[PDB]
């Protein structure tokens, strides 16, 4: 629409590109990967796990107060 | 071999699958000749006045007048009280009124009983 | 909306240009007034594909009541110009 | 302003996926009469388009280049304090 | 609310797996997202539902503007079956479109992750309807399927649009408008999650197979 | 989950019922059992305006974290240490709930064996 | 408090001025679409000031400024609830709308009624903010039905299309 | 009334359009487009009006079973998402006759150049009416097709609204 | 074809096929393009219900009966599964959470005068 | 199937008329004839002042129009609103209600100087 550089359409051909259009598009795409990697290294627990999930099948019967079978 | 198309009142039979679009006799071909003959005569009268440069107004359409007239004024003079009209009149005229009377009368009788007993929660009910 | 307008010269060139990519029409026997049937000897099925090849070029459908009446590139240009308000 | 339509002799079905369509139609005695009309979609700037996996990886080359230094810069800085 | 949302996210996402119009596909995505929000209310996580509203606005709004850019270039064409080859013809629209489709699918640490993946994890670890939970997990899978449909049928392959198209996105208004949401769509989730004061007890410890389920199902 | 299969595709009397736990006396098996202590008083939580679901034993860590956040403004990346402390404190509270759950499961099965032994001989 | 409440209400009043000026007070059709967009830009900035205060000290307040109607034991007042939900959604909605309007100037450049289109878009924004900031149900209902009616007028924007009216 | 050729050609156009929607990819469509053409070329010469009819009816029933549920539509074609879009900008020509004189004064050339068409239209009307009423059979016209002008200086009968119809992107 | 003379007031108004205006040819040159009508054409008794903004009777790709069976089956199946999933909830292996000061009796609006029933939780 | 002999003539006859009609729809260079209009003295200044690019002096117009906007759309409304709130709304009971500030153990109250006693010693653990 109105505004911006007037680019002549090319018939049956790949459309023209500018320098700022190509460069800036690349800048933000690279920003995503930089942002994902930087956070993935500082907040690795956010995507994998925060604290260990203890296995209930290993706790002893005295810490849980389970009397022996006889009494 | 395919499932033959089944047509309901809201899913019209496709013209392509309609057998009437292939078996063309002399009458069928001639029948369309007269349909387009009347359709052509009407399309002529409209264009004589539609294109006329000395006309400013509305082209009265007798078809439109007849449509509205039958929908409003020609109904009662063509009404006969019979089994169909009488039964439908009561079912659709009096049925809903009786239905809603017992729905509301039963509900208010139930509620009025609770309030007198004191079993209906009206702790902060001061707007009515 | 920001689209360049279509002109008679622009329409005609694209109309011929489409046929020149058709393997069953000789480029040297192709003219603005070359009949598709009586000159190029194309069957009606090819004629239908010609209309289809034009719809994809200009991106607008053409009625089958009117697609049958277009037999030469001159008539295709006239229809498109009439159907898109083209005067120069 | 008149627009210069390219010469139509440069559009060919050779070396593109349209050729393999010719081979399979050839085995049945059939040929594609519009193949050259649809050929422009496979040649020029549209030829050899990126893949889905590569498309999602756009810009990763520079991003990881800046990531390693960023943590490396912090590594030295955090060593001091 | 849980069951009503669960069917909505599954049904609407299911209807988006075979749609052709680009605007229709995003619409069925929005209904799928709203169904997920209703599920969040049904698991008694009202603040996560709100946090998803704020985050969802950025990229869902961007995905429509980016699609609007494509539609204008092809002269008011919306069916993806007449698109393709726009990865390099419209590099800026592709970047935002790809970035948005990764927040919708819930890539870690983007804006969508801080609400979406935080809800599915909170859904698994709650006393809740089992079928509703399953339908939500299946729906999250469908989010990636139709998100990839737009990318594949609008950026990859070979172009299917007509011979003459004015593919131009060099307008400062269009570029700037998309640019801000692109910035927000990347950082909005992180900024909000670290500033909002806590109001509940979040769930952080859970089985290994319920902590990556949101990510694992998305990849599949 | 996995324990559902042991309650739905299996015996239900051998599994805990979260709507009925605890089903055994708290002191049963614990001679002079200790009681959890709340560091934060009622007034401190009331004046701190914590959500009722946060007015728990794990409080007095949330208060400290909230106090830091009000003080580190606009530095919103700070106070991370207090977050982990409260995250850890809540985590210990969560595991203890699992311990109560595993304790419940074992006691129920213990009642099973005891009843069967005296039942079979009869 | 004074700054918090004053900057919370100015956000709403700022969005009304473009609508008020449509009564041929200051006339500039060429830049009216730009005029609406610039108002949204400033509305976002002002709304952030209450937002930052809430982030700092968790400050929230109610503003029952105008006593509209009193039906016996039901006092209805124009009440705005500036709290967690309103303080956070207003910046986001304005930030997104800011981008939508700038996009619209390009997408709708060739629309003859672009001035009407931008008035309708701003009318929706005002109604949504009434919906978001409502403190009582009746005020919430005004925004509730307001967004619906503005949706009807914008969905059927191209009214020569029988399939858009439907 | 449609002839057998007309119906056959239409089925060929629809099948490719639905087949085109099915294939999406051009090369895949090109492969299957020709095979569909082959199935049609093997019955072109059939001179049996009955066996040929059975083929068309069976051909249509096969199209219905395989038609795309959501076929591609051109935006301005009936069903595409631009049909009737700009009908809200198409104003009839007679509205200009109601403009205030101070408003016609903004376009003196257009309205000066407009009286000519109104002058031209009135003059041609009488001839156009006379031409139709003499070429019309006793019982009235049998079709909607209209004759052209058979002289020089005479415009075709019933041209005013066809010629003056609103443009396609008026605003 | 006049309507049946059953006394419902139709008189001699023609009965036309119950076909929506959406079916009529969209490319033919109609006198009234939006209504798909010709000046002088007899209008259907229910024209205002069959306008293009209302009930549409055009042929559908899938038979009407098969559409209802599939949609009803989908809704019927989903409702049953939600009921199946309601009695069999999926939860986590943890007992009821514990809150101090007698399960927050005072915080939850408990009566200050009537001393609450003591509630005690033990370290574990 | 193609056009009958007469049809090709009619379309040509109309297609010539139609293409002539579309040419009449063009506007002459003078049109539209705008009646004489007067601008304010401020408007005339910027018409010629801004002709030169001069990026250094072009931002002045940007700040000029934004400076006016902030004064007429932000400063005036906040003056009216603040005056309205301070002397008409806040003078009525419960018109503006604030959620009371949170007091943490260790804070100092600005109304009396009271210091809320800190919390007891924690069983400190580094995890
Ligand atoms: C107790 C609940 C309230 C009961 C009342 C509401 C129930 C519906 C009864 C009123 C429906 C008819 C309204 C008058 C006619 C206007 C609508 C119309 O003509 O239909 C055209 C439209 C057709 O629009 P369309 O989107 O389906 O397709 C139009 C055709 N194309 C796409 C080609 C352009 O249908 C409707 O929108 C109305 C149907 C929805 C209402 C029925 C669902 C009710 C909810 C059930 C759960
Ligand atoms: C969270 C959960 C929320 C769930 C919400 C969604 C619930 C959806 C429930 C499933 C709905 C499935 C639809 C089932 C109804 C189907 C009705 C039907 O098929 O019959 C319509 C009937 C067709 O038959 P008919 O037209 O008479 O045959 C041709 C005669 N010329 O044609 C007629 O109209 C005739 C009159 C019968 C009308 C139908 C009965 C009413
Ligand atoms: C109360 C409802 C009564 C319905 C049962 C009576 C109708 C009936 O059974 O038909 C009897 C008779 C038709 O008999 P038949 O001989 O076949 O036809 C007459 C030919 N001369 O019918 C007749 O001929 C005369 C009609 C008598 C019945 C008319 C009154 C019935 C109620 C009409 C509907 C009232 C609607 C009121 C609306 C309320 C507000 C909405
Ligand atoms: C016929 C009108 C008279 C009638 O039938 O209504 C009588 C009915 C009461 O009659 P009943 O129920 O037998 O006596 C005990 C009432 N507590 O009246 C009542 O009080 C109960 C409501 C009766 C609802 C049916 C009314 C008839 C339908 C309306 C008339 C349509 C003509
Ligand atoms: C139920 C919820 C839904 C209700 C919606 C109903 C539709 C209403 C449409 C929106 C109306 C916007 C309302 C905001 C404007 C307030 C109008 C006003 O100021 O009224 C006078 C008001 C005092 O009113 P009050 O004391 O509360 O009692 C009134 C009982 N009828 O205030 C005053 O005392 C006047 C103080 C004026 C100070 C500013 C003057 C300088 C500015 C002048 C130029 C502007
Ligand atoms: C500030 C904005 C953009 C200017 C720019 O940076 O280019 C411009 C564009 C149109 C202007 C507005 C419109 O012209 C309408 C009004 C006209 C006068 O300028 C007074 C205020 C008025 C409300 C203007 C305020 C401001 O100067 C506006 C909003
Ligand atoms: C249980 O409480 C939640 C219901 C199970 C949902 C997750 C299903 C996936 C885990 C089973 C596969 C394990 C191997 C990865």
Q: Is the dihedral of CA B46, B50, B54, B56 positive or negative?
A: positive
Closest atom of ligand 6 relative to the G39 alpha carbon? 29
For H146, which of J10, J28, J34 is closest by C-beta distance? J10
Distance of alpha carbon G25 from alpha carbon G28, whole angstroms: 10
Q: How far apart are CA H25 and CA H2, in angstroms?
A: 34
The residue nearest atom 2 of ligand 7, judged by CA position, is F1
- How many residues are present in chain E? 220
Judging by DSSP bridges, how do beta strands G74-82 and G61-71 pair with one another? antiparallel
**Phi, psi dihedrals of residue A40, rounded to the nearest 5°:** -60, -20
Beta strand G74-82 pairing with J96-98: unpaired
Give me the helices (H) in chain G, please.
Answer: 2-20, 32-57, 84-107, 114-133, 137-155, 162-165
For D81, the enclosing helix (H) or strand (E) is none
Angstrom distance (rounded) from CA G116 to CA E193: 38
- Residues 6 or more apart in contact with residue E24 via CB below 8 angstroms: E16
The first and second tokens of residue E18, run together, are 């075979």
C82 is catalytic: no
How would you class G135 by CB atoms within 10 Å of its CB: exposed for 0-12, middle for 13-18, buried for 19 or more?
Answer: middle
DSSP class of residue H98 equals: G
8 A C-beta contact, residue I43 and residue B64: yes
> Could you tell me how many helices (H) and strands (E) chain I has, helices first?
2, 0
Resolution (A): 2.5
Opening angle at CA E57, ends E51 and E60, nearest 5: 130
- State both tokens at B62: 């007798």
**Tokens for E87?**
């990865």
Which of H112, H87, H79 minimizes the C-alpha distance to H166?
H87
Task: Let me know if C87 is exposed, middle or buried by CB neighbors in 10 A (0-12, 13-18, 19+).
Answer: middle
| Torsion, Cα of C65, C70, C74, C75 (10° steps) | -20
How far apart (Å, rounded) are the C-alpha atoms in residues J29 and J24? Answer: 13
Q: What separation in angstroms does the CA of B73 have from each of B84, E59, I53?
A: 21, 59, 26
Contact I47, B67 (CB under 8 A): yes
Beta-carbon contacts of H43 under 8 Å, excluding residues fewer than 6 positions away, are H52, H55
Phi, psi of A57 (to 5 degrees): -80, 15
Query: What angle (nearest 5°) sits at the alpha carbon of residue D48, between those of residues D44 and D53?
Result: 145
User: Which H helix or E strand runs over B10?
Assistant: none
Long-range contacts made by residues I114-117, C-beta under 8 angstroms, separation at least 24?
none
Indicate yes or no: CB of H89 within 8 angstroms of CB of G160: yes
Buried/exposed B8-23: b ≥16 CB within 10 Å, e otherwise: eeebbebebbeeebee
Closest CA to J100 of G84, G60, F72: G60
Task: Show me where chain B is broken: residue before each gap, C-N > 2.5 A.
Answer: none
**Breaks following residues of chain F (C-to-N distance > 2.5 Å):** none
Phi and psi dihedrals of I122, rounded to 5? -120, 145
Cα B45 from Cα B101, distance rounded (Å): 57
Q: How many residues does chain J have?
A: 127
How many other CB atoms sit within 10 Å of the CB of residue I67? Answer: 14
- Using CA atoms, how far apart are residues J105 and J103, in angstroms rounded to an integer? 7
Please name which of H152, H146, H144 lies closest in space to residue H129, comparing C-alpha atoms.
H146
| Cβ atoms of F83 and F62 closer than 8 Å | no
H74: which DSSP letter? -
Ligand 5 atom with least separation from CA of G78: 2
Q: To probe the interface with E, which of C18, C59, C80 has the most E CB atoms within 10 Å?
A: C59
Alpha-carbon distance of E59 to E143, in angstroms, equals 14
Give the neighbor-by-neighbor strand order of the sheet with G61-71: G74-82, G61-71, J96-98
Looking at ligand 1, which residue's alpha carbon is closest to its atom 34? Answer: G163
Q: Answer whether the bond into residue F74 is a cis peptide, omega within 30°.
A: yes
- Chain E nearest-CA distance from G129, in A, is 14
How many other C-beta atoms lie within 10 A of the C-beta of residue G92? 22
Q: Is residue G4 a contact partner of residue J84, using CB atoms and an 8 Å limit?
A: no
The encoded tokens of residue G70 equal 């009193």
Structural tokens at position E44: 């008694």
Q: Rounded distance, CA H1 to CA B30, Å?
A: 10
State the DSSP H helix or E strand holding residue C78, giving kind and residue range, or none if neither.
helix C73-83
Q: At what angle do helices E91-105 and A19-42 cross, to 10 degrees?
A: 20
Name which of A17, A30, A38 to mutate to probe chain D: the one with the most chain D Cβ atoms within 10 A of its Cβ.
A30
Provide the shortest C-alpha distance from residue E42 to chain C (in Å). Answer: 46
Q: Which of C13, C26, C43, C66 is catalytic?
A: C43
Contact in structure between E30 and E85 (CB atoms under 8 Å): no
**Cα F35 from chain centre:** 13
| Experimental technique used to determine this entry | cryo-EM
CB pairs under 8 A between E and H: 26
Burial (CB < 10 A; 0-12, 13-18, 19+), residue I64, is middle
Please give the structure tokens belonging to residue H10.
């239409």
Q: Which two tokens stand for residue J104?
A: 């943490």
- The whole-angstrom separation of Cα E64 and Cα E70 is 10
Task: Give the H/E segment covering residue G61.
Answer: strand G61-71
Sign of CA dihedral F35, F36, F40, F43: negative
Beta strands of E10-116 (E only): which ranges? none
């Amino acid at each position: 629409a109105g505004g911006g550089a007037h680019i002549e359409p090319r018939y049956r051909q790949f459309p023209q590109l500018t320098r700022s259009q190509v460069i800036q598009a690349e800048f933000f795409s690279a920003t995503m990967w930089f942002w994902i990697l930087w956070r993935f290294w500082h907040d690795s627990d956010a995507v994998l796990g925060h604290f260990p999930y203890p296995d209930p099948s290993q706790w002893t019967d005295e810490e849980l107060g389970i009397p022996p079978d006889d009494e | 071999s395919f499932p033959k198309y089944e047509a309901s009142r809201l899913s019209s039979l496709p013209t392509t699958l309609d057998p009437a679009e292939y078996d063309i006799s002399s009458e069928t071909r001639k029948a369309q000749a007269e349909r387009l003959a009347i359709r052509s005569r009407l399309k002529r009268e409209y264009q004589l006045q539609y294109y006329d440069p000395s006309r400013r107004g509305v082209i009265e359409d007798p078809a439109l007048v007849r449509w509205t007239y039958a929908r409003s004024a020609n109904i009662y003079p063509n009404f006969r009280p019979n089994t169909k009209t009488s039964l439908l009149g009561a079912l659709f005229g009096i049925g809903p009124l009786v239905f809603w009377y017992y729905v509301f009368k039963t509900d208010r009788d139930r509620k009025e009983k609770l309030i007198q007993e004191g079993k209906l929660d009206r702790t902060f009910n001061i707007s009515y | 909306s920001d689209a360049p307008p279509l002109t008679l010269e622009g329409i005609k060139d694209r109309v011929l240009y489409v046929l020149k990519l058709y393997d069953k029409i000789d480029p040297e026997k192709l003219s603005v007034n070359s009949h598709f049937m009586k000159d190029l000897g194309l069957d009606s099925l090819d004629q239908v594909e010609i209309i289809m090849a034009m719809e994809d070029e200009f991106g607008f459908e053409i009625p089958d009541i009117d697609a049958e009446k277009l037999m030469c590139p001159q008539e295709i240009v006239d229809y498109i110009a009439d159907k898109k308000d083209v005067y120069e | 302003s008149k627009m210069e339509l390219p010469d139509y002799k440069q559009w060919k079905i050779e070396g593109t996926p349209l050729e393999t369509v010719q081979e399979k139609l050839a085995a049945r005695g059939l040929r594609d009469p519009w193949g050259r009309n649809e050929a422009w979609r496979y040649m020029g700037g549209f030829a050899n388009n990126v893949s889905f996996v590569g498309a999602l990886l756009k810009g990763f080359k520079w991003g990881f280049a800046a990531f390693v230094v960023a943590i490396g810069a912090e590594y030295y800085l955090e060593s001091q304090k | 609310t849980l069951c009503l949302g669960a069917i909505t996210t599954l049904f609407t996402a299911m209807c988006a797996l075979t749609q052709n119009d680009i605007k229709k596909i995003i619409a069925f995505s929005t209904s799928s997202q709203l169904g997920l929000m209703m599920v969040t209310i049904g698991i008694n996580q009202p603040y996560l539902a709100f946090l998803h509203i704020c985050t969802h606005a950025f990229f869902k709004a961007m995905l429509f503007m980016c699609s609007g850019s494509i539609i204008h270039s092809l002269n008011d064409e919306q069916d993806i079956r007449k698109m393709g080859g726009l990865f390099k013809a419209m590099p800026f629209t592709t970047t935002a479109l790809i970035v948005g489709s990764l927040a919708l699918t819930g890539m870690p640490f983007l804006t969508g992750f801080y609400s979406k993946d935080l809800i599915i994890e909170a859904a698994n670890t709650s006393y809740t309807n089992a079928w509703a939970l399953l339908m939500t997990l299946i729906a999250t899978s469908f989010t990636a399927i139709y998100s990839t449909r737009i990318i594949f049928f609008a950026l990859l392959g070979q172009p299917r649009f007509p011979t003459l198209v004015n593919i131009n996105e060099n307008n400062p208004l269009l570029i700037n408008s998309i640019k801000r949401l692109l910035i927000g769509s990347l950082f909005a989730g992180y900024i909000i999650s670290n500033n909002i004061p806590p109001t509940t007890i979040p769930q952080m410890t859970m089985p290994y197979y319920l902590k990556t389920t949101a990510l694992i199902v998305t990849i599949l | 989950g996995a324990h559902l299969a042991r309650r739905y595709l299996g015996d239900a009397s051998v599994e805990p019922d979260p709507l009925r736990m605890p089903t055994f006396p708290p002191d049963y098996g614990f001679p002079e059992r200790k009681e959890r202590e709340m560091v934060a008083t009622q007034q401190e939580m009331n004046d701190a305006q914590l959500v009722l679901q946060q007015r728990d034993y794990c409080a007095h860590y949330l208060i400290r974290f909230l106090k830091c956040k009000r003080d580190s403004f606009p530095n919103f990346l700070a106070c991370k240490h207090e977050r982990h402390d409260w995250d850890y404190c809540e985590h210990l509270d969560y595991v203890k709930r699992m311990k109560e759950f595993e304790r419940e499961r074992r006691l129920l099965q213990r009642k099973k064996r005891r009843e069967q032994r005296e039942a079979d001989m009869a | 408090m004074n700054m918090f409440s004053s900057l919370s209400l100015v956000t709403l009043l700022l969005l009304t001025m473009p609508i008020m000026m449509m009564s041929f007070n200051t006339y500039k059709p060429s830049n009216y679409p730009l005029y609406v967009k610039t108002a949204i830009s400033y509305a976002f900035i002002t709304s952030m000031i209450p937002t930052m205060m809430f982030i700092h000290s968790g400050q929230e307040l109610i503003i029952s400024n105008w006593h509209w109607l009193t039906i016996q034991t039901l006092k209805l007042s124009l009440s705005f609830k500036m709290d967690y939900f309103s303080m956070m959604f207003i910046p986001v909605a304005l930030f997104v709308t800011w981008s939508i309007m700038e996009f619209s100037m390009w997408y709708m450049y060739s629309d003859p009624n672009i001035n009407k289109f931008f008035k309708y878009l701003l009318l929706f924004l005002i109604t949504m903010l009434i919906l978001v900031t409502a403190n009582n149900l009746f005020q919430l209902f005004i925004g509730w039905e307001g967004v619906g009616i503005m949706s009807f007028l914008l969905i059927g924007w191209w009214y020569g299309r029988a399939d858009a009216n439907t | 009334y449609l002839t057998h050729q007309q119906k056959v050609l239409r089925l060929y156009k629809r099948a490719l359009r639905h087949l085109e929607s099915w294939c999406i990819h051009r090369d895949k469509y090109r492969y299957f487009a020709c095979l569909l053409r082959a199935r049609f070329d093997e019955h072109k010469n059939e001179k049996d009006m009955v066996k040929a009819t059975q083929l068309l009816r069976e051909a249509e029933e096969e199209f219905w079973h395989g038609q795309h549920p959501q076929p591609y539509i051109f935006p301005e074609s009936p069903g595409g998402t631009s049909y009737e879009r700009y009908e809200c900008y198409k104003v009839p020509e007679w509205c200009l006759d109601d403009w205030h004189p101070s408003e016609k004064a903004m376009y003196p050339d257009y309205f000066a150049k407009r009286e000519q068409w109104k002058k031209l239209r009135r003059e041609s009307w009488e001839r156009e009416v006379k031409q139709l009423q003499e070429e019309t059979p006793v019982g009235g016209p049998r079709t909607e097709a209209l004759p052209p002008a058979r002289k020089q200086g005479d415009l075709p009968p019933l041209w005013w609204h066809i010629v003056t119809r609103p443009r396609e992107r008026p605003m | 074809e006049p309507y049946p003379d059953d006394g419902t007031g139709y008189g001699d108004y023609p009965k036309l096929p119950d076909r929506s205006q959406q079916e009529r040819d969209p490319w033919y040159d109609w006198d009234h393009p939006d209504l798909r009508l010709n000046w002088g054409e007899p209008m259907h008794w229910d024209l205002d219900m069959y306008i293009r903004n209302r009930v549409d009777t055009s042929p559908t790709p899938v038979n009407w009966n098969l559409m209802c069976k599939h949609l009803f089956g989908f809704v019927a199946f989903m409702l049953f599964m939600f009921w199946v999933g309601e009695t069999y909830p999926a939860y986590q292996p943890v007992g009821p959470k514990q809150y101090p000061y007698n399960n927050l009796y005072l915080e939850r609006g408990g009566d200050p005068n009537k001393e609450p029933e003591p509630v005690v939780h033990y370290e574990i | 199937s193609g056009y009958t002999p007469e049809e090709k003539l009619r379309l040509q006859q109309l297609r010539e008329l139609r293409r002539r009609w579309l040419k009449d729809q063009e506007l002459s260079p003078r049109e539209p004839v705008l009646p004489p209009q007067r601008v304010s003295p401020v408007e005339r200044f910027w018409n010629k002042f801004l002709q030169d690019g001069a990026l250094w002096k072009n931002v002045i117009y940007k700040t000029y129009r934004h400076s006016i906007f902030a004064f007429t759309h932000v400063l005036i409304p906040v003056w009216i609103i603040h005056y309205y709130l301070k002397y008409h709304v806040t003078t009525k009971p419960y018109t503006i209600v604030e959620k009371k500030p949170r007091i943490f153990p260790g804070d100092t109250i600005l109304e009396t100087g009271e210091v809320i006693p800190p919390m007891k010693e924690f069983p400190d653990q580094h995890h």
